Amino acid sequence: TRTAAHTHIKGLGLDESGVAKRVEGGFVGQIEAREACGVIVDLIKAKKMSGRAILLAGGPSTGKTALALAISQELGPKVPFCPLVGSELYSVEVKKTETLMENFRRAIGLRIKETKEVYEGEVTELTPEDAENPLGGYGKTISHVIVGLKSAKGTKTLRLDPTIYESIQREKVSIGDVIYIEANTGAVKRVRSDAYATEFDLETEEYVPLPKGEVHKKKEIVQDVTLHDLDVANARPQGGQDVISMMGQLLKPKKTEITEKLRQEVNKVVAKYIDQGVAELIPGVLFIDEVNMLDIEIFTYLNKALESNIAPVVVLASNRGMTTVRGTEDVISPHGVPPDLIDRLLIVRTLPYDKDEIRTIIERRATVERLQVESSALDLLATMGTETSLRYALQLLAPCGILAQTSNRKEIVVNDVNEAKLLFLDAKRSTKILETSANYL
Amino acid sequence: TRTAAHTHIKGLGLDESGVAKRVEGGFVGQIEAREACGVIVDLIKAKKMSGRAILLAGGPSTGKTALALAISQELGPKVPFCPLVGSELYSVEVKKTETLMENFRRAIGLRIKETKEVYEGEVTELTPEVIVGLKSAKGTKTLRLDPTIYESIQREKVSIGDVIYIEANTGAVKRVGRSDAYATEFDLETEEYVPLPKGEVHKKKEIVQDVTLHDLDVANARPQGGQDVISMMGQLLKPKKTEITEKLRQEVNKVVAKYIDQGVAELIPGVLFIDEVNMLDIEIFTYLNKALESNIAPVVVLASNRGMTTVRGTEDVISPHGVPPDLIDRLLIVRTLPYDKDEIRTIIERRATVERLQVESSALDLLATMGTETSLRYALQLLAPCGILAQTSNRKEIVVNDVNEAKLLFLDAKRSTKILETSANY
Amino acid sequence: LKSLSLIAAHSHITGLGLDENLQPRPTSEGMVGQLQARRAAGVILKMVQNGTIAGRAVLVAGPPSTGKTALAMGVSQSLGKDVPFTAIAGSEIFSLELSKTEALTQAFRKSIGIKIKEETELIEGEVVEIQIDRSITGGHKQGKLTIKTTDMETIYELGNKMIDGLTKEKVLAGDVISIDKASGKITKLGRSFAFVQCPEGELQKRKTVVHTVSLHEIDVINSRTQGFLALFTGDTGEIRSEVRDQINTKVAEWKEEGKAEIVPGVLFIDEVHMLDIECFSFINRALEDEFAPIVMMATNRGVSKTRGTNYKSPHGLPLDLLDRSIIITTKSYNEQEIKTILSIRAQEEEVELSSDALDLLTKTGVETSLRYSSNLISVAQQIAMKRKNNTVEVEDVKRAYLLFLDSARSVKYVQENESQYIDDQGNVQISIA
Amino acid sequence: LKSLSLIAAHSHITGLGLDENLQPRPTSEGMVGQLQARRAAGVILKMVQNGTIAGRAVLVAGPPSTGKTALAMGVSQSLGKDVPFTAIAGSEIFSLELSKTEALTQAFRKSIGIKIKEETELIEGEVVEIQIDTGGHKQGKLTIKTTDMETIYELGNKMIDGLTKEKVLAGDVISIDKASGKITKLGRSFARSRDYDAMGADTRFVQCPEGELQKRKTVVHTVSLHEIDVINSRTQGFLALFTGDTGEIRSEVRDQINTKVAEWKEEGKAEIVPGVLFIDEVHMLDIECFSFINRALEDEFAPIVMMATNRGVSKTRGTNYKSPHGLPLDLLDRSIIITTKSYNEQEIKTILSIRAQEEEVELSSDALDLLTKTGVETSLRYSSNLISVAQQIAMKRKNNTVEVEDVKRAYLLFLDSARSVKYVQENESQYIDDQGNVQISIA
Amino acid sequence: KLFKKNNQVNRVDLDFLNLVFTLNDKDLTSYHAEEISKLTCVKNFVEEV
Ligand SMILES: Nc1ncnc2c1ncn2[C@@H]1O[C@H](COP(=O)(O)OP(=O)(O)O)[C@@H](O)[C@H]1O
Ligand SMILES: Nc1ncnc2c1ncn2[C@@H]1O[C@H](COP(=O)(O)OP(=O)(O)O)[C@@H](O)[C@H]1O
Ligand SMILES: Nc1ncnc2c1ncn2[C@@H]1O[C@H](COP(=O)(O)OP(=O)(O)O)[C@@H](O)[C@H]1O
Ligand SMILES: Nc1ncnc2c1ncn2[C@@H]1O[C@H](COP(=O)(O)OP(=O)(O)O)[C@@H](O)[C@H]1O
Ligand SMILES: [Mg+2]
Ligand SMILES: [Mg+2]
Ligand SMILES: [Mg+2]
Ligand SMILES: [Mg+2]
Incomplete structure (x- = not known):
């Protein structure tokens, strides 16, 4: 139930065979950009190339963040999407290289799936199956152990090796409370039942209704975890009275420089599990916008890392033109990016919309906000939006509607908008205020 | 075997009067530098004075660092030579001045004779409250464990049938392992079988393990008892180097004075080294300016060569060798001259002999021509490549084809620069 | 056994395809052309497998996108197996738990190994x-x-x-x-x-x-007690030099008697065109060390000021380290070379391109860079897959080219409309009118 | 004054509580004027109180001492309680262990409201x-x-x-x-109170x-999610709530907490409460901060920020080019402007009298008019200090009323800025330049 | 031994005035404290006084 200049851009107006139409799927216009991003999405789903990159070129409110959020939505939970700006890379705690390695390992995922048999029910009995002691000594020798169980509508007794007696000894099964044992792995595990819950006025005992389903069942689990999670689990020492783990916990551990030995071992183990079929790797799209501030060292580092084998696609965004590259003034290059990167990367352009498309944008934003304006005022709204800007009209529509609501109205008529534009100003009027007033204003 | 540009130098070659031969033990010319180095060698061999330093100035491939290694290998094993570069003094967790004094303190050698004893035997019983009944070949004695070393003994899983090498003075315990006497326990026993140690359990020896000043500094600043658990906490709470102040300096001076006056110990000086002091900032220069005005700062050598260049750490101090004027005025200059055609010939000859290259006459002369034409290092770096090229091009000797292939393949700075002024891109 | 990966740019060439005399085939084992570069790589690899020489600096220069890193990785892979080899980049020199001095020291130490x-x-x-x-x-x-x-x-x-x-x-x-x-x-x-x-x-x-272990690993395992955590966590910095000297003499006497065997490695440095002069002097002192892996370099620019200095020394490197280094310059590609590279990249992608696809790839390589072609191939292949056939005709390539942009086109678009996007004095335009 | 609070320079102004009509009054709750500004502020406050739309922005400009900080404090007072206010100045983001970007993120995380x-x-x-x-x-x-x-x-x-x-x-x-x-x-x-004479601390x-x-x-609890972040930062993360060793909170915890709050809101166990951000004099901030906020203020959880500055045509810190208001065009586009106006005599005298009432200070006609003249030729803050000093003079003069006597004594013994500058320019001999140029010699 | 002698001379018990709150949350819950505070105000010890 929240909205911040959003909740109206979903998808890209996509379709099978890659066609983008005029007004559909939230987006309006930018057929070239939307089809290019759809092709990019298909490439990401293919999972063939490593470490590609595409930049953007345009002015304010052209879809850069909108396109990024659209592709992020199109990815879904299957493929992670990591948005970022290079300004967050100013990590005082640890160096830039380690931060980029951590982002890389975060943008690499592995999906694990497995199924374990479960034998459920309630222990109806426990009896020995005696045989005479064959080896040295005589007396008792239990051949095996068979124990009954009953979940809802499913009753079955499990025959099992006699060794499960130790589990019965170890887990203190009592009789008919909780059962967790498998055919091969074996051993019972305990977690009483609500039927006995009223036998005590107050206790600290656990209870549970009767288990449902049949005695034998299976459970399916799917979990997508990044390799960085495994790396940090390996690195961070967790434990108890052992001096290493409790000393680390006392020390408030920081971003220690993990050695590449453990990283490569983790990669080897992950690959050896994945090839066996028990696991499979899925990439993750890292996205960084407003990249003009990124300095020369990061430019060279990304130029080096573009060729990495495990490198996932990283999509970059900016809007600068003929400027001096941030980091140092020696390189005065387009888009605040040295030509070392421009000539080696795919450039995509954007441009603002026409009056019809921008008017549809304003109208749809009004519809999402639930406010509305009649034609006799929306025509002048469109004319002023063309005159001033898109963000100006989009942001100032809400004050007009709220003023009307406080003025006992629901529509937006000529008065409210006239006085609203009379009161507030914009960037050009801001410069005029700067260079007209002579009282420090 | 491996050779890295050195080990061809095997001494200055100074005669009974301190005059070195022309080409002996990897040397070429530079009689001024050799004679000054011999003078400094004699002054150090005097072992009476201290607190004096010199710089030797020379261009690239002029034998400065070569002379430093020569003096190092001339001094001998016990007297240490301290190599250090201006990049080394930039430490991480301690300030540069303290690092310089750590280098100074570890520079001076101090022959000392301290005592160690070790208890080593088969354990017979343990009595918690601690008894460890070590049984050696002829002795069986029961020490008492302090609670900390008792805990260390407990963690050592030592039981009847085990031998431990627990030192007496440090106190730390190192188990030797299961006794070889109980070899009849399992035909495939995992633990190693070690017999009962010879002599008494409390074996005593006279040791000549010496100590540098930094060594006994870290001995009490960060105790390193080692194997005991409390020693583990001692070396874990402060494992790093702490900023030792002048108070501990005076305490250490008193301790070393009393130890050296005990009679058995002695003192020997040392030599420290610095390369390219031009990059050093004005702060370290100013601090060392007041640091050499002391009574403990040992001998250090400077290797730098800069013209009318601004001293790093400043913006207007222009001086030769990148050294501030005060340090130049309080430091002794040794001169080095550029190498000559015959020096280049002999250098390439010796560098071929050490590299097991039987380079013939005309090949050696042409290599000398390249050495005299562009730079000595450019010719020197080609000896192994030309030999390997002739090996691949089935030639025991080095014909002009090999050197021409090297000169068209492995270019010098001049040819690359000639390329660089004609290029559509850098 | 196989390490996970995707279709990488350098996943297309393995080795150099040299000969007994190291003569270069025009196109073998992935590598195409660069005959004298291949000869230099071969003599370098024989030199390093000789094992009699330590501490020799080698630098390679050339125009951008000219297979220098390709040759470097081919050399690295051609080193065989069972021998360690360590590589770093131009921005990993700096550290906080370590000084640049100690970071470069550890980088040098990691390459050499021993086997007991x-x-x-x-x-x-x-x-x-x-x-x-x-x-x-x-x-x-x-x-x-x-x-x-x-x-x-x-x-x-x-x-x-x-x-x-x-x-x-x-x-x-x-x-x-x-x-x-x-x-x-x-x-x-x-x-x-x-x-x-x-x-x-x-x-x-x-x-x-036989167990293998590197020099720095031996230095760090026995120096202290918690260094075993430093084997993975790296919780150490500036190891005491006494332990280093003790392990060095231990290794020397082990080699002398013969209990173990040395397996010297190689250190690799690329894009060193930017680095502090302090690190350059560090290289200048470390090259003549008794134990020293062979060190490679790389550069893309020519006359330029090295970091920590103010003089535009050639090759981005001070003249002292320039002279003590072996220079292997690289020149541009032949059109035959670039079209062979395009063909081998396409077959590495195993994308069954048509003849006209490679024709336009070669035309683009003549007009502009080759990696831009290495992305145009992918986009054209995907657009053709939008037509479901396993071939790419002129239509897909032309559509991808007139929908996407290289450097020059976008540069000229911004040039003719400098007042639209943000300029150096900070003005951008949102309205088309 | 529940806490040890003594007095404010603007304590009479507690709340921008506009009437139901929202039409501004010539005088209200002690404030006078700001008519269109107060109307827009009421609209903004209602929009914040809506709690259904995020990612809004308002900019405030004008010469200082015009109640801008008082404006924000009155807005906060009119917003009532259970809505913590982020009191962060411009010079609080350049912290050592907290980089500016995630410091702003932490400020926003504090700014959110939630119920449990x-x-x-x-x-x-x-x-x-x-x-x-x-x-x-x-x-x-x-x-x-x-x-x-x-x-x-x-x-x-x-x-x-x-x-x-x-x-x-x-x-x-x-x-x-x-x-x-x-x-x-x-x-x-x-x-059990009588059985033991002195009960132990445990026994009550x-x-x-x-x-x-x-x-x-x-x-029921009202705890910000950043507090939960600090709590679950480590195995025992309860000591770090007050010490301040957060440590540049990672974004994985942030998105996990966003998912948790979303699912608890869908479960009905949690509900949101609007928050506001306000920092004064945004001009003295890095261009990186403006670039970051221009993207981070349109997120799903994007509380409005009370931008306010007063500088002129200058350069955004972190750049070199001349910029509007010392602010980038991108930040000066996605917002709306609040401006102030030069003081007039009537509100000057009324504000001076109201302040005197707040200070328990009695002012007569002559002193009030003279101090109005001072506060119109100079700013009002000089007269606001002069009322205090003159009441001190009066209570030392064995009277409580303030008149021409105490005001004139203050005027003679306290110097106006213009005459101070004139005295500086005419007595520069005793002063020092950058190069240490001082004329210590007298004769 | 030359310093720690003015301890009992001018010590005001901060724990007895409940200002060690940061160290009191280890075994404290809100409802119990509020219930006790509500059932604290006089009404139990002034009667016999
Ligand atoms: N092409 C577009 N299509 C739809 N919405 C857009 C488009 N461009 C901008 N917007 C709106 O503007 C917001 C993002 O603006 P953005 O394009 O990122 O500005 P800038 O161009 O300065 O980066 C989104 O919330 C979106 O609703
Ligand atoms: N007198 C000499 N005899 C043999 N080799 C020398 C001599 N002088 C210099 N060299 C060689 O020249 C190289 C440069 O000498 P060195 O003193 O190490 O540095 P530099 O002289 O450039 O300061 C060294 O590798 C050394 O092997
Ligand atoms: N002769 C070649 N053989 C194989 N691959 C090449 C060749 N020339 C260029 N490439 C490819 O083009 C890219 C250019 O990179 P490279 O030439 O290695 O370094 P740089 O980009 O610094 O010149 C490489 O990733 C490589 O895959
Ligand atoms: N409308 C008003 N009514 C009463 N007092 C006011 C009014 N406007 C300003 N003031 C007084 O003027 C002062 C304005 O200071 P303020 O503008 O908050 O400082 P800054 O410009 O640094 O934010 C306040 O202390 C307040 O007492
Ligand atoms: Mg964005
Ligand atoms: Mg030398
Ligand atoms: Mg390359
Ligand atoms: Mg203010």
Whole structure:
């Protein structure tokens, strides 16, 4: 139930065979950009190339963040999407290289799936199956152990090796409370039942209704975890009275420089599990916008890392033109990016919309906000939006509607908008205020 | 075997009067530098004075660092030579001045004779409250464990049938392992079988393990008892180097004075080294300016060569060798001259002999021509490549084809620069 | 065994395809052209496998996108196996737990290695009988495990602590089991069934195992106590030089007597065109060290100011280290070379491009860069896959080209409309009017 | 003045509580004027109170001392309680262990409002007096005697050995959880107050609760999610709530917490509460901050920020080019502008009188008019200090009224800025330039 | 031994005035504290006084 200049851009107006139409799927216009991003999405789903990159070129409110959020939505939970700006890379705690390695390992995922048999029910009995002691000594020798169980509508007794007696000894099964044992792995595990819950006025005992389903069942689990999670689990020492783990916990551990030995071992183990079929790797799209501030060292580092084998696609965004590259003034290059990167990367352009498309944008934003304006005022709204800007009209529509609501109205008529534009100003009027007033204003 | 540009130098070659031969033990010319180095060698061999330093100035491939290694290998094993570069003094967790004094303190050698004893035997019983009944070949004695070393003994899983090498003075315990006497326990026993140690359990020896000043500094600043658990906490709470102040300096001076006056110990000086002091900032220069005005700062050598260049750490101090004027005025200059055609010939000859290259006459002369034409290092770096090229091009000797292939393949700075002024891109 | 990866740019060439005399084939083992560069790589690899020479700086220069890193990785892979080799980049020199001095020191140390041999013994067979005498809630037990092969009947025994070691996990009376003597470690060769047949041969086999370890690893393991955590966490910095000297003399005397064997490695540095002059002097001092891996460099620019200085020294490198380095310059590609590269990249992508696809790829390589073609191939292939055939005609390539942009086109678009996007004085335009 | 608060330069202004008409008044709650500005501020405050739309922005400009900080404080007061206000100045983001970007993120995380509810159960009034008939707990039933029900509770394996836990004399009010929970002491009884003369710190005496025992109690909390982040930062992350060693909170925790709050809101266990951000004099901030906010203020959880500055055509810190207001065009585009105006005589005199009332200071006609002249030729702050100094003079002059005497004494003994600059320019001889140019010599 | 002698001379017990709150949350819950505070105000010890 929240909205911040959003909740109206979903998808890209996509379709099978890659066609983008005029007004559909939230987006309006930018057929070239939307089809290019759809092709990019298909490439990401293919999972063939490593470490590609595409930049953007345009002015304010052209879809850069909108396109990024659209592709992020199109990815879904299957493929992670990591948005970022290079300004967050100013990590005082640890160096830039380690931060980029951590982002890389975060943008690499592995999906694990497995199924374990479960034998459920309630222990109806426990009896020995005696045989005479064959080896040295005589007396008792239990051949095996068979124990009954009953979940809802499913009753079955499990025959099992006699060794499960130790589990019965170890887990203190009592009789008919909780059962967790498998055919091969074996051993019972305990977690009483609500039927006995009223036998005590107050206790600290656990209870549970009767288990449902049949005695034998299976459970399916799917979990997508990044390799960085495994790396940090390996690195961070967790434990108890052992001096290493409790000393680390006392020390408030920081971003220690993990050695590449453990990283490569983790990669080897992950690959050896994945090839066996028990696991499979899925990439993750890292996205960084407003990249003009990124300095020369990061430019060279990304130029080096573009060729990495495990490198996932990283999509970059900016809007600068003929400027001096941030980091140092020696390189005065387009888009605040040295030509070392421009000539080696795919450039995509954007441009603002026409009056019809921008008017549809304003109208749809009004519809999402639930406010509305009649034609006799929306025509002048469109004319002023063309005159001033898109963000100006989009942001100032809400004050007009709220003023009307406080003025006992629901529509937006000529008065409210006239006085609203009379009161507030914009960037050009801001410069005029700067260079007209002579009282420090 | 491996050779890295050195080990061809095997001494200055100074005669009974301190005059070195022309080409002996990897040397070429530079009689001024050799004679000054011999003078400094004699002054150090005097072992009476201290607190004096010199710089030797020379261009690239002029034998400065070569002379430093020569003096190092001339001094001998016990007297240490301290190599250090201006990049080394930039430490991480301690300030540069303290690092310089750590280098100074570890520079001076101090022959000392301290005592160690070790208890080593088969354990017979343990009595918690601690008894460890070590049984050696002829002795069986029961020490008492302090609670900390008792805990260390407990963690050592030592039981009847085990031998431990627990030192007496440090106190730390190192188990030797299961006794070889109980070899009849399992035909495939995992633990190693070690017999009962010879002599008494409390074996005593006279040791000549010496100590540098930094060594006994870290001995009490960060105790390193080692194997005991409390020693583990001692070396874990402060494992790093702490900023030792002048108070501990005076305490250490008193301790070393009393130890050296005990009679058995002695003192020997040392030599420290610095390369390219031009990059050093004005702060370290100013601090060392007041640091050499002391009574403990040992001998250090400077290797730098800069013209009318601004001293790093400043913006207007222009001086030769990148050294501030005060340090130049309080430091002794040794001169080095550029190498000559015959020096280049002999250098390439010796560098071929050490590299097991039987380079013939005309090949050696042409290599000398390249050495005299562009730079000595450019010719020197080609000896192994030309030999390997002739090996691949089935030639025991080095014909002009090999050197021409090297000169068209492995270019010098001049040819690359000639390329660089004609290029559509850098 | 295989390491995970995707279709990488350098996943297209392996080795150099040299000869006995190191003569370069025009196109072999992926590498195309660069004949004298291939010869230099070959002489370098023979020089490093000789093992008699340490500490020689080598630098490579050339225009952007000119296969320098391709040659470097080919050399690195051509180094064979069973020998360590370490590589770094132009921005990993700096550190916080370490100084740049110590970071470069560790980078130099990691390459060289040692290998120590030792004897190993093992028992192997199939547990087909087992009998353990164990009191319930007691503290005294014995056992007899009949680990056997298909050759003889052998009831082995356990000592004091071996019962837990051989009963930590499931041990049955059919299972093929191999255990070691000096440690009692359990290794699951596989269950007999319910699926490996009972083994033949003799139970107890002896062998030899050689363990490898790098110089810096030896320095860090024995210097202190918590350094084992530093093997992974890296919680150490500026190891005391006394331990370094002790391990160095230990290695020297080990090599002298012959207990172990040295396996010298190689250190690799690329894009060193930017680096502090302090690090350059660090290289200048480390090259003549007695133990020194062969060091490579790389550069893209020419006359330029090295970091920490103010003089535009050639090759981005100070003249002192320039002179003491072996320069291997690279020149541009031939059109034959670029079209062969396009073909080998396409077949590495195993994308069945048409002839016109490679024609336009070569035309683009003539007009502009080659990696832009290495992305145009992918976009054209995907647009053709939008038509479902396994071929790419002129239509897909032309559509991809007139929908996407290289450097020059976008540069000119911004040039003619400097007042639209943000300029250096900070003005951008949102409205088309 | 619940806390040790003494007085404010603007304490008379507590709340931008515009009337139901929202039409500005010539005078209201002590403030005068700001008519269109107050109307827009009321609109903004209502929009914030809506709690359904995020990612809004408003900019404030104009010369200082025009109540801008007072404007924000009145907005906060009119917003009531349960809405914590982020009090962060411009010079608080360049921190050492907290980089500016995630510092702004932390400020926003604090700015959010949320509510949480929970339910538990207890037993009240358990004046037990155990008596059983050694060990083993044979026939393990305990007497329980509260105000309403006085019976004997049967126990089991966990209680017959749980009553021997928390070893007590059983003559006190105790609490047990009927939902399989542990035993907790709430204090002894008044009869136990007299048995021991000096009761130990642990022992306190509280009456038996006047009612039944089985109490199902609901609790409500208003804790920001960043506090939960600090709590679950480590295994025991409770010490770090106040110390301040957060450590540049990672974004994985941020998105996990976003998912958790979304799912709890869908479950109804949590509901949101609007928040505001305000920092004064945004001009003296890095261009990186403006670039970051221009993207981070359109996120799903994007509370509005109260931008405010007063500089002119200058350069955004972190760049070189001339910029509007010392702010980038991108930040000067996605917002709306609030401006102030030069003071007039009437509101100057009214504000001076109101301040005198707030300071418990009496001002007569002559002093009020003279100080209005001072505050119109100069700013009003000089007269606001002069009323205080003149009342001090008066109460030292054995009177309470302020007139021409104290005001003139202050004028002679306290210097105007313009005349101070004139004195500086005419006595520069005694002053020092950058190069240490001082004329210490006199004769 | 030359310093720690003015301890009991001018010590004001901060714990007795409940200002060690940061160290009191280890075994504290809100409902119990509020219930005790409600059943704290006089009404139990002034009667016999
Ligand atoms: N092409 C577009 N289509 C739809 N919405 C857009 C488009 N461009 C901008 N917007 C709106 O503007 C917001 C993002 O603006 P953005 O394009 O990122 O500005 P800039 O161009 O300065 O980066 C989104 O919330 C979106 O609703
Ligand atoms: N007198 C000499 N005899 C043999 N080799 C020398 C001599 N002088 C210099 N060299 C060689 O020249 C190289 C440069 O000498 P060195 O003193 O190490 O540095 P530099 O002289 O450039 O300061 C060294 O590798 C050394 O092997
Ligand atoms: N002769 C070649 N053989 C194989 N690959 C090449 C060749 N020339 C260029 N490439 C490819 O083009 C890219 C250019 O990179 P490279 O020439 O290695 O370094 P740089 O980009 O610094 O010149 C490489 O990734 C490589 O895959
Ligand atoms: N409308 C008003 N009514 C009463 N007092 C006011 C009014 N406007 C300003 N003031 C007084 O002027 C001062 C304005 O200071 P302020 O503008 O908050 O400083 P800054 O410009 O640094 O934010 C306040 O202390 C307040 O007492
Ligand atoms: Mg964005
Ligand atoms: Mg030298
Ligand atoms: Mg390359
Ligand atoms: Mg203010």
